Scaffold this active site. Structure first.
Site, PDB file in Angstrom:
ATOM      1  N   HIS A  88       0.807  -1.233   0.000  1.00  0.00           N
ATOM      2  CA  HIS A  88       0.000   0.000   0.000  1.00  0.00           C
ATOM      3  C   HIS A  88       0.851   1.300   0.000  1.00  0.00           C
ATOM      4  O   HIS A  88       0.774   2.107   0.929  1.00  0.00           O
ATOM      5  CB  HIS A  88      -1.030  -0.042   1.147  1.00  0.00           C
ATOM      6  N   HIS A  92       1.446   1.537  -5.823  1.00  0.00           N
ATOM      7  CA  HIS A  92       0.134   0.891  -5.916  1.00  0.00           C
ATOM      8  C   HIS A  92      -0.918   1.930  -6.414  1.00  0.00           C
ATOM      9  O   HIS A  92      -1.659   1.647  -7.369  1.00  0.00           O
ATOM     10  CB  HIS A  92      -0.287   0.291  -4.569  1.00  0.00           C
ATOM     11  N   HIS A 128      -7.141   7.016  -3.153  1.00  0.00           N
ATOM     12  CA  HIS A 128      -7.882   5.935  -2.493  1.00  0.00           C
ATOM     13  C   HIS A 128      -7.187   5.230  -1.320  1.00  0.00           C
ATOM     14  O   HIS A 128      -7.904   4.621  -0.526  1.00  0.00           O
ATOM     15  CB  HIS A 128      -8.414   4.889  -3.498  1.00  0.00           C
ATOM     16  N   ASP A 129      -5.850   5.276  -1.215  1.00  0.00           N
ATOM     17  CA  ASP A 129      -5.149   4.593  -0.098  1.00  0.00           C
ATOM     18  C   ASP A 129      -4.184   5.532   0.641  1.00  0.00           C
ATOM     19  O   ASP A 129      -3.296   5.061   1.347  1.00  0.00           O
ATOM     20  CB  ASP A 129      -4.396   3.356  -0.607  1.00  0.00           C
ATOM     21  N   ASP A 240      -8.554  -1.134  -8.337  1.00  0.00           N
ATOM     22  CA  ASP A 240      -7.874  -1.570  -7.115  1.00  0.00           C
ATOM     23  C   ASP A 240      -7.236  -2.970  -7.227  1.00  0.00           C
ATOM     24  O   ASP A 240      -6.165  -3.182  -6.657  1.00  0.00           O
ATOM     25  CB  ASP A 240      -8.843  -1.529  -5.916  1.00  0.00           C
TER      26      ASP A 240
HETATM   27  C1  LIG Z   1      -6.291  -4.870   0.273  1.00  0.00           C
HETATM   28  C2  LIG Z   1      -6.916  -5.877  -0.692  1.00  0.00           C
HETATM   29  C3  LIG Z   1      -8.300  -5.561  -1.244  1.00  0.00           C
HETATM   30  C4  LIG Z   1      -9.171  -6.595  -1.585  1.00  0.00           C
HETATM   31  C5  LIG Z   1     -10.412  -6.330  -2.135  1.00  0.00           C
HETATM   32  C6  LIG Z   1     -10.817  -5.022  -2.374  1.00  0.00           C
HETATM   33  C7  LIG Z   1     -12.120  -4.739  -3.048  1.00  0.00           C
HETATM   34  F1  LIG Z   1     -11.969  -4.386  -4.305  1.00  0.00           F
HETATM   35  F2  LIG Z   1     -12.933  -5.791  -3.083  1.00  0.00           F
HETATM   36  F3  LIG Z   1     -12.797  -3.766  -2.463  1.00  0.00           F
HETATM   37  C8  LIG Z   1      -9.957  -3.984  -2.024  1.00  0.00           C
HETATM   38  C9  LIG Z   1      -8.719  -4.251  -1.462  1.00  0.00           C
HETATM   39  N1  LIG Z   1      -6.872  -7.271  -0.152  1.00  0.00           N
HETATM   40  C10 LIG Z   1      -7.649  -7.779   0.887  1.00  0.00           C
HETATM   41  C11 LIG Z   1      -7.552  -9.137   0.937  1.00  0.00           C
HETATM   42  C12 LIG Z   1      -6.616  -9.535  -0.076  1.00  0.00           C
HETATM   43  C13 LIG Z   1      -6.143 -10.792  -0.443  1.00  0.00           C
HETATM   44  C14 LIG Z   1      -5.243 -10.859  -1.472  1.00  0.00           C
HETATM   45  F4  LIG Z   1      -4.787 -12.082  -1.825  1.00  0.00           F
HETATM   46  C15 LIG Z   1      -4.774  -9.756  -2.160  1.00  0.00           C
HETATM   47  C16 LIG Z   1      -5.247  -8.502  -1.776  1.00  0.00           C
HETATM   48  S1  LIG Z   1      -4.534  -7.120  -2.673  1.00  0.00           S
HETATM   49  C17 LIG Z   1      -3.179  -7.775  -3.570  1.00  0.00           C
HETATM   50  O1  LIG Z   1      -5.504  -6.645  -3.617  1.00  0.00           O
HETATM   51  O2  LIG Z   1      -4.018  -6.187  -1.718  1.00  0.00           O
HETATM   52  C18 LIG Z   1      -6.190  -8.360  -0.736  1.00  0.00           C
HETATM   53  C19 LIG Z   1      -8.392  -9.995   1.841  1.00  0.00           C
HETATM   54  C20 LIG Z   1      -9.217  -9.209   2.862  1.00  0.00           C
HETATM   55  C21 LIG Z   1      -9.649  -7.848   2.315  1.00  0.00           C
HETATM   56  C22 LIG Z   1      -8.441  -7.003   1.899  1.00  0.00           C
HETATM   57  C23 LIG Z   1      -7.545  -6.590   3.075  1.00  0.00           C
HETATM   58  C24 LIG Z   1      -8.304  -5.680   4.041  1.00  0.00           C
HETATM   59  O3  LIG Z   1      -8.615  -4.532   3.661  1.00  0.00           O
HETATM   60  O4  LIG Z   1      -8.575  -6.141   5.172  1.00  0.00           O
HETATM   61 MG   LIG Z   2      -7.663   0.596   0.437  1.00  0.00          MG
HETATM   62 ZN   LIG Z   3      -5.804   0.143  -2.999  1.00  0.00          ZN
END
Ligand SMILES: C[C@H](c1ccc(C(F)(F)F)cc1)n1c2c(c3cc(F)cc(S(C)(=O)=O)c31)CCC[C@H]2CC(=O)O
Ligand SMILES: [Mg+2]
Ligand SMILES: [Zn+2]
EC number: 3.1.4.17
Length: 348
Positions: A88, A92, A128-129, A240
């Site tokens: 993050h 990204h 967004h982040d 994202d």
């Molecule tokens: C931060 C990201 C995410 C996922 C969906 C969305 C969306 F689009 F659906 F809205 C946004 C942001 N993320 C998360 C997971 C996860 C697993 C992965 F293998 C890869 C990513 S990655 C590479 O994309 O960072 C993951 C699991 C729990 C939720 C999340 C973390 C968290 O925020 O607790």
């Molecule tokens: Mg985010």
């Molecule tokens: Zn993001």
């Protein structure tokens, strides 16, 4: 510890943008407007220039009469507003912004949304982040952070913080890109940015999914205001998770970055006397299985929905499915929990 991530601060990079910050997109890369382009290949020092180039190419600098040096200051502030956790960070936000530019250049976004809405989507992508700490919403609550104190009762702790940081940059001296905007339009931008940033929380996506599905099931309506609201949320989540639409090497490197970030949070929770989630516990996580689950349940449905509304987006969904098939094929070489002693997935 691996959980300590620094902030750059609180002129040479500004003058460099003031020298040749607006370059035609083809001069950056001949493949810059293709879904096969990997924005993470662009040197970090050239990213601020690429942001301006995409804004100019979409004609937002002239359509909204954005003051070029104000835009140059705003972009650098957004860039400086990111910390350095493994995933993050600015790179990204930059890659997510590039994918929004890809959707405008390859899909016919102007034939689905207003110019202001697409411009809001791009700005929201950059913001967004902002100020992400390498920790999730559950961690804010458990660590009883200032962010949890301010936002947990309202929901989406980090997402409300990211939007607040975007507003703070806008209210900084010489960074308000929307300064010359009308009162009703300036507020339209702030409201679009809020809903778009809030749509990046998984919890939100999970709540609006039935409504996303029904929108695709019935068919998009250019005259329906709610359809514009729901499309923007699906588009934000597609930007994202856009690293999953690239080649195997990108999905493998992003897995390495996200699990290094997730595992550092888990080590911090263990030091706090708390038990982390399995995916955040380096002694329990088995990355190929976690990747397959994330691709099947989160990423693949998002791109499958995008394919249903945009025919030209079919290639995106197939690359995501292919990357998923690749994780199943590779699982025989990856026989360990967590990451190797050197934090690298290169061996795969
Ligand atoms: C931060 C990201 C995410 C996922 C969906 C969305 C969306 F689009 F659906 F809205 C946004 C942001 N993320 C998360 C997971 C996860 C697993 C992965 F293998 C890869 C990513 S990655 C590479 O994309 O960072 C993951 C699991 C729990 C939720 C999340 C973390 C968290 O925020 O607790
Ligand atoms: Mg985010
Ligand atoms: Zn993001």
């Amino acid at each position: 510890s691996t959980s300590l991530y620094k902030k750059a601060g609180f002129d040479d990079e500004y003058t460099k943008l003031l020298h040749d910050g607006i370059q035609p997109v083809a001069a950056i890369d001949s493949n810059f407007a293709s879904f096969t382009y990997t924005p993470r290949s662009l040197p970090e020092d050239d990213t601020s220039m690429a942001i301006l180039s995409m804004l100019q190419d979409m004609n937002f600098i002239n359509n909204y009469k954005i003051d070029c040096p104000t835009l140059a200051r705003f972009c650098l502030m957004v860039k400086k507003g990111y910390r350095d956790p493994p995933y993050h960070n600015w790179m990204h936000a930059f890659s997510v912004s590039h994918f929004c530019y890809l959707l405008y250049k390859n899909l016919e976004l102007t034939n689905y949304l207003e110019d202001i809405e697409i411009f809001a989507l791009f700005i929201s992508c950059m913001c967004h982040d902002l100020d992400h700490r390498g920790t999730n919403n559950s961690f804010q609550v458990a660590s009883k952070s200032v962010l949890a104190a301010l936002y947990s009762s309202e929901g989406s702790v980090m997402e409300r913080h990211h939007f607040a940081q975007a507003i703070a940059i806008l209210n900084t001296h010489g960074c308000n890109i929307f300064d010359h905007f009308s009162r009703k339009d300036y507020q339209r931008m702030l409201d679009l940015m809020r809903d778009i940033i809030l749509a990046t929380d998984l919890a939100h996506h999970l709540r609006i999914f039935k409504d996303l599905q029904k929108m695709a099931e019935v068919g998009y309506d250019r005259n329906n205001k709610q359809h514009h609201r729901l499309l923007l949320c699906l588009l934000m989540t597609s930007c994202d998770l856009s690293d999953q639409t690239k080649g195997w090497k990108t999905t493998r490197k992003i897995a390495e970055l996200i699990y290094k970030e997730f595992f550092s949070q888990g080590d911090l929770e263990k030091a706090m006397g708390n038990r982390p989630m399995e995916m955040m516990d380096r002694e329990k996580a088995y990355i190929p299985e976690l990747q397959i689950s994330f691709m099947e349940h989160i990423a693949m449905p998002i791109y499958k929905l995008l394919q249903d509304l945009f025919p030209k987006a079919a290639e995106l969904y197939e690359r995501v499915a292919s990357n998923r098939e690749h994780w199943t094929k590779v699982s025989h070489k990856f026989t360990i929990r967590g990451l190797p002693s050197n934090n690298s997935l290169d061996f795969l």
